[PDB]
Amino acid sequence: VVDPFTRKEWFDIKAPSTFENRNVGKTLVNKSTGLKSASDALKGRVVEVCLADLQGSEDHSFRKIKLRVDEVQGKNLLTNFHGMDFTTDKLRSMVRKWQTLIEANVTVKTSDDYVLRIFAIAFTRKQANQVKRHSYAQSSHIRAIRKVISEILTKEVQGSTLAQLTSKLIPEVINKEIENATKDIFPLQNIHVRKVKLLKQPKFDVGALMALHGEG
Amino acid sequence: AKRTKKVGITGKYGVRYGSSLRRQVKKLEIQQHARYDCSFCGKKTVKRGAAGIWTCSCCKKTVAGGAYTVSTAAAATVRSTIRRLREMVEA
Amino acid sequence: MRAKWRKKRTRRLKRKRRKVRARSK
Amino acid sequence: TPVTLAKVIKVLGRTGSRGGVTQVRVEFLEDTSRTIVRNVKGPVRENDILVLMESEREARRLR
Amino acid sequence: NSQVFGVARIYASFNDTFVHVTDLSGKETIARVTGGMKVKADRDESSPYAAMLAAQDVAAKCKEVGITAVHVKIRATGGTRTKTPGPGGQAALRALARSGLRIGRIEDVTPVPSDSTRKKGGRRGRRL
Amino acid sequence: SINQKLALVIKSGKYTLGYKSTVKSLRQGKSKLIIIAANTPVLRKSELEYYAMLSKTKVYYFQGGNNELGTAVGKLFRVGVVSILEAGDSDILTTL
Amino acid sequence: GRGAPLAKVVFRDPYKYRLREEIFIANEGVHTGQFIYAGKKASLNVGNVLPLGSVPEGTIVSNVEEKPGDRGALARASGNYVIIIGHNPDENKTRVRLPSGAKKVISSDARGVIGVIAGGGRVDKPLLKAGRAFHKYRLKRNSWPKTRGVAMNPVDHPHGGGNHQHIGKASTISRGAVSGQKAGLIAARRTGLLRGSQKT
Amino acid sequence: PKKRASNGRNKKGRGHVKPVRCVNCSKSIPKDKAIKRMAIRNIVEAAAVRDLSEASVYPEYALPKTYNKLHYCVSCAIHARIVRVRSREDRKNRAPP
RNA sequence: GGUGAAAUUCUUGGAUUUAUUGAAGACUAACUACUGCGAAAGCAUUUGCCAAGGACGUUUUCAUUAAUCAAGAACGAAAGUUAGGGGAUCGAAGAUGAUCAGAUACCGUCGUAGUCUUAACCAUAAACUAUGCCGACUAGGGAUCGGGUGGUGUUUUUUUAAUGACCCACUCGGCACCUUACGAGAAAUCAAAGUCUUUGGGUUCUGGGGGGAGUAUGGUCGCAAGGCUGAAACUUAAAGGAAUUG
């Protein structure tokens, strides 16, 4: 008897311009009223997006990005980075029977005071003539791999910010240097960064939000 | 020699009172009348003064705390959760 | 005749039996 | 209700508890790419014409 | 590309199905009906036919408001429960395809622990 | 670690134990390393920090109490501060 | 009369060159000769006096004020403490949980010491003795011994009388009874031995 | 009579392994025992793949698979036909088909 | 919701779902095996400390310092029990709703003690590999973990080098396995349950038909529940063990 789809508006969200598809989609609020604003009901939304749709490719579809609504500008609103996971089909589809699973996480606050807790998954693999059936790892080796992965993640994040982090996590260059950095201990297929998370935001940083946005 | 088998410091409570309550007061009298390790001076030199008051008698210090020991389980959880949340404030 | 309720009826046997001997003694 | 015509592709075999319901795959008589498994009551030969009250049930083995 | 996206969460369970539509955000839901609110038999609440009718009416409200292409998230009860989708989600997603809407980006989401709390039934089980 | 190489110091080189002898050696310039147990009062802690800033010696906060430092020097009592004159064999003076 | 001991704390008066003194119901861990920081912009230690807006969600604070400025009313007895529950930033109120399990919504500018009050664990030791309870009460107030109303006379209390010691009318006294009738179980929701839920 | 030389299933030289809950009835059965099957499904069934590929944007993208590793107990497995009881000799026939 | 189908209950004071954020506790799945480690009970997140430990290598060391164990001691799953601190999920007792000829039972919704932990008892299990422990010999095989050795072997790349991984062959130790029986067995079955009337390598416990009965009572331990020690009266011709046919 009220029918609120005569009330819900249409807002077009915009992504940081690290991603080639700046446009994503349109969310909806109820009416901008006195004492209760549509901007106020918009202040805290989190959007999950398939990184295939953002990058315009198809092979990159195994990832997902969490954007955070923080500012709105006149039927237009800007999003900020909040977290990254893989998708569950890919995480399970990697995890095989008969190989150890090297897995590590580290907490680090960046140059700007975003702290991030950042994860890295790598497996074991065969080597092209291995007649042994399974190929596990000694756990002292998995200790060495966690050490190297902790070093390389804290080095390739701590001296940067959200923008350079995004530019590193899109084309898979970190795990490229990881694979290249530990050919010399154990084989390790499927080296990946599976989960990054924002924990503590700095002060509101909306100038760097325009440094994401604002070109177009 | 051996004074008593199982009553300890509660020969001052005699044949009275019921053995159960003499158990609880045996344990808690051991606690509130035993010395403790002063972390401020590294000496086993503490005693109790009142509920809460724990004094170190060599380095002449005082510290508030549990009515029968230097610290309780509740205060252990309190110091850890304050340390956690203060760290994430720092972060 | 059967042994686990030899057992629980045995412990109740000993409970009733010990109480009544503690009455008389 | 837009009733659905169909045409028998091949039978599979009489199932159900008492045995008296066959399963046949049929093509919708206008969409040769779409055939579908379907429970039928009586006796079904090949290549004949079925009628359906719906097209999107495709019920399963019965016991 | 004049098609706008939404999210269809399909919660399949062995008592009921849920077909739920939100925006690209997570608050401000669009429209949800269930087979359990569709038919009245209390055991057909998780029927595939029930999820088919629920998907049809969610599609009706969805095309009436104008949402066209939808990211699908499908899941079970999960946790220490069943882990696995019942007879709902399959027929629901087929009916959502046969509706006339647009479906993309299906990935399973279902909540699953790193070894949660005890399951219910108590060590010897739901021995019936 | 630090315990092994401190045991190596007491084996080979030379030392002094105690606060008064430590500050006496530090005025006299015979010492190079000052090791402070972390349960020293902050006044005496920062006092020996000031004397180390005067004397250009190295200083290191032994992570524990003076009981742990007494175990680390092989004595059955507490040492608030232990001053390494020369290690003899340990590379502690080179590292850290 | 308390068990929870106190800290005579020496502050500096910012407006006149003197030493104004204050008495705190201490927490655990606080000690002689401790620098103690009070107010909003301070950092969250054990011993400091943050307000509830500037604590985060979920912090153990004791001697929590109830309304802004009234110098401490909640959670002050020997071993108590108030968990912060969860906020509402506009219309600035903070929800706390109170040592009776209570969920209260108090002023965000209410202060409080951080920690749990010293002298915890007091009531785990049996009194054992009329003598012990005698000195506990003769340093509080004259409410010990208590003679039972059923072992007085009928004139002295509504349970007295009889050739036995029994009461007769039901002993759950309502709230809309008058004075002189309220001596018993007062306006009871339920009686009897609680083999049941916390019901909150 | 000792029916199995493997007693159930394969400890052979531990002691205690952790127990695990049957999917159908939540019996806490130890993990060494307790029929394991790894079942994967496509999220859609075999008859709807052409339907969804006909009614999809983003042409020829992927089609992912639900994975699940269903644990089962003896009672639930034999009751629900994952396992059949086998002859005295083919008990040693350790081969899956 | 929940079920075999239902009802108990929760819901326009918005229940279930959605989203955001936080707290609280236990847990440590996917890796997960006919793999490891530990005296066993047992132990699966990272990282650090703390001390241990098996095996391997050894042209080191001492030179019988041993094997097995009555009394004796340590540890000892879980349930218990004594007070705390927690106490989320599951949850004996209890509540109901079902199912029933009845259901104080399985099924449903909750719910205390518990679950968790600190300090202290307890000392038991199908603690089961139902196979004492140390030794020597007796038969074929392929995978496996840990260490070693060799290879005109492979690979990583920056270039061969340094490994590290992989491959081939051996060796010690390890959890197992697959075939045959020379053998053993009452037999299922067994590389030890073999090397036994053709009877003896060192040694510790245990059983002597079934019930009675782990009861009696004496003793000791335990807060208690109960532990370890432990018969008799009388009764009965069986109790049984692998295997065949129905």
Swiss-Prot record, chain C:
GO biological process, one term: cytoplasmic translation
One GO CC annotation: cytosol
Localization (cell): Cytoplasm
GO MF, one example: structural constituent of ribosome
Span list, region Disordered: 1-25
Alphabetical UniProt keywords: Cytoplasm, Ribonucleoprotein, Ribosomal protein
Note: Present with 4910 molecules/cell in log phase SD medium. There are 2 genes for this protein in yeast.
Family membership: Belongs to the eukaryotic ribosomal protein eS32 family.
Assembly description: Component of the small ribosomal subunit (SSU). Mature yeast ribosomes consist of a small (40S) and a large (60S) subunit. The 40S small subunit contains 1 molecule of ribosomal RNA (18S rRNA) and 33 different proteins (encoded by 57 genes). The large 60S subunit contains 3 rRNA molecules (25S, 5.8S and 5S rRNA) and 46 different proteins (encoded by 81 genes).
Functional summary from the UniProt entry: Component of the ribosome, a large ribonucleoprotein complex responsible for the synthesis of proteins in the cell. The small ribosomal subunit (SSU) binds messenger RNAs (mRNAs) and translates the encoded message by selecting cognate aminoacyl-transfer RNA (tRNA) molecules. The large subunit (LSU) contains the ribosomal catalytic site termed the peptidyl transferase center (PTC), which catalyzes the formation of peptide bonds, thereby polymerizing the amino acids delivered by tRNAs into a polypeptide chain.
Protein's recorded name: Small ribosomal subunit protein eS32B
Organism name: Saccharomyces cerevisiae (strain ATCC 204508 / S288c)
Swiss-Prot record, chain D:
Gene Ontology process terms (BP): maturation of SSU-rRNA; positive regulation of nuclear-transcribed mRNA catabolic process, deadenylation-dependent decay; ribosomal small subunit assembly; ribosomal subunit export from nucleus; translation
Protein localization: Cytoplasm
Superkingdom assignment: Eukaryota
Gene Ontology molecular function terms on file: structural constituent of ribosome
CDD domains referenced in this protein's UniProt entry, alphabetically: S1_S28E (cd04457)
Keywords on record: Acetylation, Cytoplasm, Ribonucleoprotein, Ribosomal protein
One cellular component (GO) term of this entry: cytosolic small ribosomal subunit
Post-translational modification: N-terminally acetylated by acetyltransferase NatB.
Pfam families found in the cross-reference section: Ribosomal_S28e
Subunit details: Component of the small ribosomal subunit (SSU). Mature yeast ribosomes consist of a small (40S) and a large (60S) subunit. The 40S small subunit contains 1 molecule of ribosomal RNA (18S rRNA) and 33 different proteins (encoded by 57 genes). The large 60S subunit contains 3 rRNA molecules (25S, 5.8S and 5S rRNA) and 46 different proteins (encoded by 81 genes).
Other facts noted in the record for this chain: Present with 94500 molecules/cell in log phase SD medium. There are 2 genes for eS28 in yeast.
Entry's family note: Belongs to the eukaryotic ribosomal protein eS28 family.
Stored PANTHER family: 40S RIBOSOMAL PROTEIN S28 (PTHR10769), SMALL RIBOSOMAL SUBUNIT PROTEIN ES28 (PTHR10769:SF3)
Name listed for the protein in its UniProt record: Small ribosomal subunit protein eS28A
Gene transcribed to yield this protein: RPS28A
From Swiss-Prot, chain E:
GO molecular function annotation: RNA binding; small ribosomal subunit rRNA binding; structural constituent of ribosome
Keywords for the protein's UniProt record, in alphabetical order: Cytoplasm, Nucleus, Ribonucleoprotein, Ribosomal protein, Ribosome biogenesis, rRNA processing
Region span, Disordered: 108-128
UniProt cross-references to InterPro entries, sorted A to Z: Ribosomal_uS11, Ribosomal_uS11_CS, Ribosomal_uS11_sf
Pfam families in the record: Ribosomal_S11
Subcellular location: Cytoplasm; Nucleus, Nucleolus
NCBIfam families documented for this protein: PRK09607.1 (NF007176)
PANTHER family noted in UniProt: 40S RIBOSOMAL PROTEIN S14/30S RIBOSOMAL PROTEIN S11
Additional remark text: Present with 3370 molecules/cell in log phase SD medium. There are 2 genes for uS11 in yeast.
Record family assignment: Belongs to the universal ribosomal protein uS11 family.
Record-given protein name: Small ribosomal subunit protein uS11B
Organism from which the protein derives: Saccharomyces cerevisiae (strain ATCC 204508 / S288c)
Source species taxonomy: Eukaryota, Fungi, Dikarya, Ascomycota, Saccharomycotina
From Swiss-Prot, chain F:
UniProt superkingdom: Eukaryota
GO cellular component terms attached to this protein's record: cytoplasm; cytosol; cytosolic large ribosomal subunit
Localization: Cytoplasm
Location in chain, cross-link Glycyl lysine isopeptide (Lys-Gly) (interchain with G-Cter in ubiquitin): 14, 45, 75
Primary residence: cytoplasm
Matches recorded under Pfam families: Ribosomal_L7Ae (PF01248)
GO MF terms, alphabetically ordered: pre-mRNA 5'-splice site binding; RNA binding; structural constituent of ribosome
Keywords for the protein's UniProt record, in alphabetical order: Cytoplasm, Isopeptide bond, Ribonucleoprotein, Ribosomal protein, Ubl conjugation
GO biological process, one term: rRNA processing
Protein family membership: Belongs to the eukaryotic ribosomal protein eL30 family.
Note: Present with 59300 molecules/cell in log phase SD medium.
UniProt-recorded name of the protein: Large ribosomal subunit protein eL30
